[PDB]
Amino acid sequence: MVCKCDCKNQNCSCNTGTKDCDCSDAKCCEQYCCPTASEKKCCKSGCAGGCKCANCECAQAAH
Ligand SMILES: [Cd+2]
Ligand SMILES: [Cd+2]
Ligand SMILES: [Cd+2]
Numbered sequence: 001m002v003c004k005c006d007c008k009n010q011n012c013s014c015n016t017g018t019k020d021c022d023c024s025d026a027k028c029c030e031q032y033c034c035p036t037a038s039e040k041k042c043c044k045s046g047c048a049g050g051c052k053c054a055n056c057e058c059a060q061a062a063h
Contacts, residue, residue: 001026011039024039
């Protein structure tokens with residue numbers, strides 16, 4: 001329920017893009033791995049860096 005910004009990620013509804021907590025309408029304060037997963041859910045949320053999903057910015061070869 002809202003991230004209130006000031007998270008441990010980037011481009012996650014904060015003072016660096018959108019207005020304030022605009023990402024989704026239920027969750028956002030998650031621990032993403034890549035910038036293409038913050039509000040793209042390009043990969044399963046929870047990746048603490050270097051996951052495996054090649055479909056995301058982490059690489060290029062599907063997940
Ligand atoms: Cd991932
Ligand atoms: Cd990803
Ligand atoms: Cd990743």
